[PDB]
Amino acid sequence: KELLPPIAHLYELPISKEASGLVHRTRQEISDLVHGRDKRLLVIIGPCSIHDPKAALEYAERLLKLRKQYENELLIVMRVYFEKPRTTVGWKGLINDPHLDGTFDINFGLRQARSLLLSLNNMGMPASTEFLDMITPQYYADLISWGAIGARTTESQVHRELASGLSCPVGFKNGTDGNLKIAIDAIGAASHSHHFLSVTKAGHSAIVHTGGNPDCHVILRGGKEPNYDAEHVSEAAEQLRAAGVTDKLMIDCSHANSRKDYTRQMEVAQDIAAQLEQDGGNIMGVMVESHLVEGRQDKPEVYGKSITDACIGWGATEELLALLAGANKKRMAR
Amino acid sequence: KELLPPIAHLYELPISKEASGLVHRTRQEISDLVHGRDKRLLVIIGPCSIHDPKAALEYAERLLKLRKQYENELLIVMRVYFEKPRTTVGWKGLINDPHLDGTFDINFGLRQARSLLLSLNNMGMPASTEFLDMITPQYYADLISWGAIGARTTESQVHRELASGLSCPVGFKNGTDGNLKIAIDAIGAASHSHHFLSVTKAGHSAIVHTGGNPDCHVILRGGKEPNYDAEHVSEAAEQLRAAGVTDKLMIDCSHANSRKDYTRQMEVAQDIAAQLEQDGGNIMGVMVESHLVEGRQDKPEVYGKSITDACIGWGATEELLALLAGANKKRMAR
Amino acid sequence: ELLPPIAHLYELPISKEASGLVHRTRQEISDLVHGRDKRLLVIIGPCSIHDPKAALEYAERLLKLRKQYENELLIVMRVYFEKPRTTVGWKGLINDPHLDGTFDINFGLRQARSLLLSLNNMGMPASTEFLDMITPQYYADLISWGAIGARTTESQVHRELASGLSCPVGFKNGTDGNLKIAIDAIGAASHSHHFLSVTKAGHSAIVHTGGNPDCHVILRGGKEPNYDAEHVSEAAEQLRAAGVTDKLMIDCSHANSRKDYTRQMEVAQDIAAQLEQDGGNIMGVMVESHLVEGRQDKPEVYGKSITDACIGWGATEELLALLAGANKKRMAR
Amino acid sequence: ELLPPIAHLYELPISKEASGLVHRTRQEISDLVHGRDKRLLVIIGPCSIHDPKAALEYAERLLKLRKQYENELLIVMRVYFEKPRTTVGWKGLINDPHLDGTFDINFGLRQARSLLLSLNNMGMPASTEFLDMITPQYYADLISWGAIGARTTESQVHRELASGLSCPVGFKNGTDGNLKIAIDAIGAASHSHHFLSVTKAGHSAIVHTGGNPDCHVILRGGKEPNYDAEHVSEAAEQLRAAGVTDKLMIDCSHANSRKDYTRQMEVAQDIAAQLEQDGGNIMGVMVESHLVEGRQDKPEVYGKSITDACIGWGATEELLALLAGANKKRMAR
Numbered sequence A, B: 001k002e003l004l005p006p007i008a009h010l011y012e013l014p015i016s017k018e019a020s021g022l023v024h025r026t027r028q029e030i031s032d033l034v035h036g037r038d039k040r041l042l043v044i045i046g047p048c049s050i051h052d053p054k055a056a057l058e059y060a061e062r063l064l065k066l067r068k069q070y071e072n073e074l075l076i077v078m079r080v081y082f083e084k085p086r087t088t089v090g091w092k093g094l095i096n097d098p099h100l101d102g103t104f105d106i107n108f109g110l111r112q113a114r115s116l117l118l119s120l121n122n123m124g125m126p127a128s129t130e131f132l133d134m135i136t137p138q139y140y141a142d143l144i145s146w147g148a149i150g151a152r153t154t155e156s157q158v159h160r161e162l163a164s165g166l167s168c169p170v171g172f173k174n175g176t177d178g179n180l181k182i183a184i185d186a187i188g189a190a191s192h193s194h195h196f197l198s199v200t201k202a203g204h205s206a207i208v209h210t211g212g213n214p215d216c217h218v219i220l221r222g223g224k225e226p227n228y229d230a231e232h233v234s235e236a237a238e239q240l241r242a243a244g245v246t247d248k249l250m251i252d253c254s255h256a257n258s259r260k261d262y263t264r265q266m267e268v269a270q271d272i273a274a275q276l277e278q279d280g281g282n283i284m285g286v287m288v289e290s291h292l293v294e295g296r297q298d299k300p301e302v303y304g305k306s307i308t309d310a311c312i313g314w315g316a317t318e319e320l321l322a323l324l325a326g327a328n329k330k331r332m333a334r
Numbered sequence C, D: 001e002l003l004p005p006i007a008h009l010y011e012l013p014i015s016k017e018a019s020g021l022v023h024r025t026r027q028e029i030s031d032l033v034h035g036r037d038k039r040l041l042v043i044i045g046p047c048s049i050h051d052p053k054a055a056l057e058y059a060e061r062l063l064k065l066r067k068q069y070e071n072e073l074l075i076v077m078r079v080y081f082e083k084p085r086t087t088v089g090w091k092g093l094i095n096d097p098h099l100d101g102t103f104d105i106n107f108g109l110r111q112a113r114s115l116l117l118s119l120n121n122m123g124m125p126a127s128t129e130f131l132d133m134i135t136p137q138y139y140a141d142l143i144s145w146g147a148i149g150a151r152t153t154e155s156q157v158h159r160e161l162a163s164g165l166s167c168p169v170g171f172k173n174g175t176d177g178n179l180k181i182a183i184d185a186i187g188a189a190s191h192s193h194h195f196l197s198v199t200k201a202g203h204s205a206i207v208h209t210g211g212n213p214d215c216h217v218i219l220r221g222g223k224e225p226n227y228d229a230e231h232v233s234e235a236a237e238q239l240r241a242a243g244v245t246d247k248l249m250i251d252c253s254h255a256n257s258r259k260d261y262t263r264q265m266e267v268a269q270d271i272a273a274q275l276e277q278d279g280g281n282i283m284g285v286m287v288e289s290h291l292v293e294g295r296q297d298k299p300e301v302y303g304k305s306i307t308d309a310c311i312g313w314g315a316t317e318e319l320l321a322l323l324a325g326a327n328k329k330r331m332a333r
């Protein structure tokens, strides 16, 4: 079917001066955290997946007040995930199937994704996403301040290639059974120049030569056992230094680290707060799955409630952010 | 140099009637093995990587005689791997860097890949490869009788999507630390229809809708420990049946099953031969890394010797194939 | 970077109403071309579009007359986006929409399509000269009738283009008065051709056209004007000799008015007299008309041509009334 | 599907020798166009190429004379791949290379590029009429001189094309004899244009050309022939009035021979007499020549035109010897 090239969307939705400045400055600010120049905590927080732009904008408006309130302690960036990896089969996200009905209206999905990202940046909320697909990034990447390569794709050479040409900092996740070495290896790969095939803004395949991404880091997201605690952070930092890459890392509160209880995210955050208060020198960030309303649902019946992984709700989000701000204020003073 | 689209190569190197027939029949023959309709053993055998077409053709000519000799017991298909996944960085194969000098002459690489595959199929030798890149398959897939998705990419949704649209049977490998469930999950994914972005024969990005691949199976290739033995095969078969997919599987002699020691492939093959002789009902295939000359080398100084993973040499190859043919002859008679 | 036709089609898909109007107008014109209906096709409007707002106001006025005269006249607006220059100069709204030498062709194509969609949606079918080879994929679906210009009628690439258009096409006599090139052009464009063109996705491709069975000639003057009965009669003889339709269109403007917009009425009066006496070979006329008469070098005055001089709105009413009255009589015979 | 230019360029890259010949020939011709050298450019060869074998044999014979006469004549072969028809008919080797209505354009472009590369590699530069808008990207790098035809000289899209070509371009007078269209064409093509075209990758794009400073006119007859001293003198006055080069080319064939190949020699003799008397405004001639004289509808006889009738090889030797002798005298004055 009849795919519009990136230039069609760029024409309708050009990046504004304000969005461009926010992206540029947020990428910079994050690089500073990755390389230990600033001790604020990056907080990648928001829905597991975007399925409704209206709810995402309402969430963003609430989060913006806290982004501002905590700006001396936290760098808050919203989760705006358009692409979802499934264990076998399922809904792959807003771009692949925006109408949530198996119509796969990808032209509409890319348009809606770009539109939402532009609105978010224009209101002052920077955005993050997982880069899963090889061809979709040309459509919206200019609006992304931080990227994840997922646990299921961190070992993949084509994903490492992709990351090597992205202009935002990138977090590589440990593997789904807990293998951290694949993410450490991934920084090594993505930091170098690569030559590979990719698709241009005009929608044509081409040979690209990337310059390498100097702003990669790992993310601890659990495996067979969770890996959030001080012992695990310390072990990861040793391995990072041994490989000659940044020993500043991010901890995902959700997924394998919270296991089967989405409310465990608060426990993980409390453990992280305690680390920050004792020492926590190797922590530069955290990820939290948060929405307007807690939990999850198979069908999009309740407004502001995840249709993918379960999330904490708004009230818990306030507590979690206050907790982390208070703890990091102390780390920063020390 | 701009990227030539698939149609340029197809124009210069159209598939012949003979090649087309060999591919069609070999794919069918393999499907029969995958689904338990024939008890011959698929043997995916040849170099770790192709770096010299002249040596590959000489290898193929030798292997053809054994392909014919053993055709009632074994279905022999050559390893013709053009794309290599690296742990961090390194030579990614003949397509990416055909001159082996960091010039990345991908147009020449794709041409040379297609030319070699056409010559192989024309001489009567079917071909196999790992499908790693998303855009390169349109150049040569029509000449491939069996595909692998690698241990490092089996969990990747974009690779499962790719496999779902391939016209050849596909083997998914267990993960690098030994996780089999990701390959079982991968069959589940790739057997279904997907919608995703891909590039057309004219070199333009497009939305593709695949029909699913009914001929996927798993490959046991070792993890932290090898997984070739009867116990492991039996456990894998139970898990396959539980997931409702084919419980016929393939066993890689090389890689983590030989602990990266080419001299151990024969031991693995002997264990497999013993399984076939005792029962071995769930085995439909094996993989072997084999070349004209054993071992490996960093620079392509010695003719017919691998520059990637170490391989057994031609003499050991004869013993290994005779061993497997004799063992499977007995299984087939039972 | 040039956006492909599909980008514009996505933003501005043809509506059911526009699609029906185009389809039916093309049919109606085919009927005139082949002598099945005796209404007079009237291709009327600005020499060139340079301001969509004025074009929409003009269209709204013309629509009332299109409806009023529908039993005698088939009124279709001139919506010309591409202009052939003698040497160099402004080539039209698509090539340079901001009229300042910035050549914002993406904006120009968008604006052309948008205007054409709005016109068809309001009930006013559109005509244009097809000059460029690649631009038609952007808006052709919204055009009910096309012209191949005097300067391009003899060109094989223009005859190829016409052969694949889904609308009727008028070919003009050459700039010094040669009619045979337009007769030859019908011959060419009526047949199937294979040639290179660009797809809706913006890629070059081999196209195989089916031929255009609805082509006709247009008399637009040469060294001397050619609109009179004698000239029409001579043209019709030549058309029959070549085995093509002997129903033709007469341009009031250009070489036939000797570039004097005040003479278009005189030409129309001559045509009216032909229709009243006999005028069996006439199926249409062209008139260069705008809100305000004359022309100007710079787009200072609203609704006034920046290319060839046009008659104004008041003269347009008189001219259309004149032609409707004359053709009512022809049709009654 | 249509292969983009890059596919053909990959298989048939221009050689160093071909590249040098093209570069130097274009410069040599520019020198003639602007009156810096008094050699006579001779564009000579088949009306159309339909068989590459015969073209290469022709070229080998012509090369000897190219060399022999190099101090008096600059000989460039006619290698025409695109033909304008009066109505319908075979459009040339690119459009239908198998001459059977299969329209194998991919094969045609390949064969065109291959022949041009072989010709340049053997030392014979090439000329062609540029008719089609998309084909030139495939082979233009191998062309030393281009014609815009009589039927397309007035066409703005052809003037745009010429403005971006890297070779000198001759514009022909119109088919009824109008020279002003070609003079106007130089004015147009010498300026910068913006328009749509297709890239080497096969995608449509906006191009901005720099203008072509090496354009000139070609006298090719009209209703009457226009090759004589009086006509040359009158053309030169008009060229100076328009501020463009008053050095022109004279086509021996077409309407100057009244479509009679046996009259090309008479025209050449008239031109020779002009060169001997004065003939200061003449920089070139065109001649339709093949291995064997005449024409045929089907390609039955080897080396005989299937389009316009040509003189044969023997007559070609006489004609070249005549022009060399005459120009040797002009150059000595």
Ligand SMILES: C/C(=C\P(=O)(O)O)C(=O)O
Pocket: A048, A085, A149, A150, A151, A152, A173, A221, A255, A309
């Ligand atoms: C799938 C994912 C996280 P991971 O790649 O760690 O499983 C997510 O944020 O939804």
Ligand SMILES: C/C(=C\P(=O)(O)O)C(=O)O
Pocket: B048, B085, B149, B150, B151, B152, B173, B221, B255, B309
């Ligand atoms: C890298 C590879 C196999 P695996 O994907 O099991 O590591 C190979 O055949 O070279």
Ligand SMILES: C/C(=C\P(=O)(O)O)C(=O)O
Pocket: C047, C084, C148, C149, C150, C151, C172, C220, C254, C308
């Ligand atoms: C240039 C033109 C008409 P023609 O092609 O008869 O000169 C026009 O309608 O503006």
Ligand SMILES: C/C(=C\P(=O)(O)O)C(=O)O
Pocket: D047, D084, D148, D149, D150, D151, D172, D220, D254, D308
């Ligand atoms: C068609 C042509 C010349 P002209 O464009 O003067 O009619 C030719 O050389 O074949």
Ligand SMILES: [Mn+2]
Pocket: A048, A049, A254, A255, A289, A308, A309
């Ligand atoms: Mn999640």
Ligand SMILES: [Mn+2]
Pocket: B048, B049, B254, B255, B289, B308, B309
């Ligand atoms: Mn290997």
Ligand SMILES: [Mn+2]
Pocket: C047, C048, C253, C254, C288, C307, C308
């Ligand atoms: Mn006009």
Ligand SMILES: [Mn+2]
Pocket: D047, D048, D253, D254, D288, D307, D308
């Ligand atoms: Mn000719």
